[PDB]
Scaffold this active site. Sequence first.
Site: not given
Length: 181
Positions: A69, A82
């Site tokens: 992540e 993101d």
Amino acid sequence: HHDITKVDTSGASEITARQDKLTLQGVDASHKLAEHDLVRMNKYKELITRVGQKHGLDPAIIAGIISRESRAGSALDHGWGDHGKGFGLMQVDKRYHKIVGAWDSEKHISQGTEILIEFIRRIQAKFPVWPKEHQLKGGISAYNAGDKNVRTYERMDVGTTGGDYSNDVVARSQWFKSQGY
Ligand SMILES: [Co+2]
């Protein structure tokens, strides 16, 4: 004891490997990506272990998630990734959850972990005849792309980021387990 070495993995896709500019394929690529994150990960190991124990999930899987992540924080801009959708080491999607804790906090790691567990639960209800190792892998895939996307065990990463999300996570996790997580 749950033995995560029994979870099947083909590691990272070509697309994923284009990340640390690697010539390596599959599990070798996941292992290198994980290794690159080991020093940063160690800063959080005490919290990762405690959260894993409190929620009943292997700390090495939490580490694999954090490596994938956020590269254990290296890929974030002051906690964000993101395009701003994701918060923290585990990249909890702020659009769907009220965010708790600082980006590198125990409370945050606990929130991401709880969300993962809930996905694993959904996959267990969806595929009640899958072995526990497979429902775990499926829950990890769902953490990236949703449980609706998880159908055939063998294709659960189709439609995930990189086309390899749970395979990559699992392989990194297995690597972290070898490094004492
Ligand atoms: Co036991």
